[PDB]
Amino acid sequence: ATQGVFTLPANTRFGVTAFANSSGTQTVNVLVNNETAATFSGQSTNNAVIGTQVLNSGSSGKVQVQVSVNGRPSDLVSAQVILTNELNFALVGSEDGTDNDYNDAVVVINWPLG
Amino acid sequence: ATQGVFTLPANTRFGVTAFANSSGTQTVNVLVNNETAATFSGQSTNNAVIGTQVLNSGSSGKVQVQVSVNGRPSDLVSAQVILTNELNFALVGSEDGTDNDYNDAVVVINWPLG
Amino acid sequence: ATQGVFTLPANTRFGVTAFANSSGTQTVNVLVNNETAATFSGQSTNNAVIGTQVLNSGSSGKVQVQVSVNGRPSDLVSAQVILTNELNFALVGSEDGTDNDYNDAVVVINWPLG
Amino acid sequence: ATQGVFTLPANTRFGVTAFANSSGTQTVNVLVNNETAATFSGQSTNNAVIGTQVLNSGSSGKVQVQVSVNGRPSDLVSAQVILTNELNFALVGSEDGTDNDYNDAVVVINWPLG
Ligand SMILES: [Ca+2]
Ligand SMILES: [Ca+2]
Ligand SMILES: [Ca+2]
Ligand SMILES: [Ca+2]
Ligand SMILES: [Ca+2]
Numbered sequence: 001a002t003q004g005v006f007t008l009p010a011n012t013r014f015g016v017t018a019f020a021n022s023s024g025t026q027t028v029n030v031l032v033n034n035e036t037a038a039t040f041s042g043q044s045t046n047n048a049v050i051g052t053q054v055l056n057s058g059s060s061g062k063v064q065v066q067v068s069v070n071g072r073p074s075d076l077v078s079a080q081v082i083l084t085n086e087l088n089f090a091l092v093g094s095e096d097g098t099d100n101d102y103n104d105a106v107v108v109i110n111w112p113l114g
Numbered sequence: 115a116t117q118g119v120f121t122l123p124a125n126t127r128f129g130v131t132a133f134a135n136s137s138g139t140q141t142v143n144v145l146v147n148n149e150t151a152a153t154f155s156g157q158s159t160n161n162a163v164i165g166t167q168v169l170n171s172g173s174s175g176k177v178q179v180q181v182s183v184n185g186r187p188s189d190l191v192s193a194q195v196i197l198t199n200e201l202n203f204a205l206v207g208s209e210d211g212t213d214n215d216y217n218d219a220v221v222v223i224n225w226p227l228g
Numbered sequence: 229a230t231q232g233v234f235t236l237p238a239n240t241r242f243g244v245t246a247f248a249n250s251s252g253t254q255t256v257n258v259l260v261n262n263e264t265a266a267t268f269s270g271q272s273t274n275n276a277v278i279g280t281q282v283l284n285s286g287s288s289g290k291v292q293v294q295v296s297v298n299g300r301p302s303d304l305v306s307a308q309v310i311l312t313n314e315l316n317f318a319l320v321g322s323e324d325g326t327d328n329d330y331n332d333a334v335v336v337i338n339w340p341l342g
Numbered sequence: 343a344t345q346g347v348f349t350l351p352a353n354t355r356f357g358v359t360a361f362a363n364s365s366g367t368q369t370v371n372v373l374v375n376n377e378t379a380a381t382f383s384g385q386s387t388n389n390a391v392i393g394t395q396v397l398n399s400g401s402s403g404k405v406q407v408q409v410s411v412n413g414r415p416s417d418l419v420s421a422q423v424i425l426t427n428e429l430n431f432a433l434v435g436s437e438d439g440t441d442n443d444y445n446d447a448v449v450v451i452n453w454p455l456g
């Protein structure tokens with residue numbers, strides 16, 4: 001099934017943060033309404049934050065995360081979790097190799113903010 | 115029910131990250147084996163990362179997240195999600211006031227790393 | 229924090245199902261827009277599916293699960309998970325005692341149907 | 343990524359329940375320790391339960407769910423959720439066609455039981 005795609009409330013601020021756990025450089029693209037709203041690029045084998053920013057879901061509220069290592073798209077796993085019917089987490093894991101640890105690039109989206 | 119307590123596999127490196135979304139200064143304390151392993155303190159209404167570190171679950175494997183605002187303990191909400199039976203996320207939300215948005219201090223724990 | 233409350237898309241049908249794992253008779257109430265729309269009850273320590281029914285979220289989309297044993301409300305734990313940004317599960321666990329297994333009455337809400 | 347495979351505690355009882363929402367007859371296979379341990383077959387377009395049983399996770403604890411409709415393997419989506427660090431949910435959604443509602447056969451695994 002498709003992974004890394006989330007529908008947030010329209011015109012809503014949300015945070016997006018990416019961590020890296022791979023020898024290779026991670027390039028994370030965050031799409032809002034099919035348009036690149038943010039890009040994070042970095043390398044780390046110790047869960048470093050290669051990017052964190054605040055974005056706005058916009059009209060469609062459609063947000064999609066994509067990860068690639070040297071142009072090659074990583075396989076993704078994802079899910080959305082809501083706590084006490086108010087706090088939202090859109091979670092993404094990505095695998096750029098074969099060991100299937102799916103942490104090479106970890107992306108955490110959360111909302112609402114403030 | 116008890117919230118903010120997580121049983122991770124023993125002696126395992128994990129990442130812990132806190133975000134702030136409140137008018138009040140958040141104090142996020144991370145306990146491992148019931149000992150303070152890290153403490154983040156910060157104020158923000160725009161999801162600033164007031165702290166992120168890589169800790170080791172230790173021999174016990176017990177990780178607890180505590181949040182307080184100026185000495186007053188916040189109410190916590192939490193859960194753990196596992197993707198593709200391998201990628202783990204321990205999620206924590208906290209409420210320091212009366213609006214119940216539970217984002218005042220958001221904490222995310224992820225593993226495995228590397 | 230409040231538990232057992234879920235906001236479903238408006239006027240959408242969903243399935244609600246209850247499971248029992250306790251020596252005490254479980255009584256599960258499902259409120260839609262603050263009015264009970266379904267009630268299940270039974271006594272099993274072998275995960276018996278004590279009841280299931282298709283309901284409509286109505287205009288409010290608000291759904292709440294309440295669990296009581298012999299007139300006393302049980303402590304609740306819950307969360308919502310979304311898969312492939314399409315399949316929704318609203319989960320509820322309940323504890324009518326102190327042995328901390330929170331399975332005395334388990335309720336699963338899923339949608340969309342059809 | 344791999345889906346429908348869950349690592350439960352070993353030699354532990356768990357419940358597996360399947361619901362159907364499709365014109366096609368669903369065949370749900372549950373394997374334990376790499377051997378089919380249970381099979382549910384049924385049809386429903388109203389979320390009716392097509393099977394529910396209590397099984398043992400075997401020596402490795404590995405439990406795998408596979409769904410097919412007339413020989414054709416349905417695409418799976420899944421995740422595990424843990425509430426209050428003790429109540430577990432292994433969720434599976436399956437798509438036997440192209441409309442991608444992933445509810446054709448919905449499978450819920452829960453533990454502990456009793
Ligand atoms: Ca990898
Ligand atoms: Ca890695
Ligand atoms: Ca608040
Ligand atoms: Ca807040
Ligand atoms: Ca109990």
Ligand SMILES: [Ca+2]
Binds near residue numbers: 250329330331332455
């Ligand atoms: Ca019980």
Ligand SMILES: [Ca+2]
Binds near residue numbers: 439440442443
């Ligand atoms: Ca379908």
Ligand SMILES: [Ca+2]
Binds near residue numbers: 342444445446
């Ligand atoms: Ca269907």
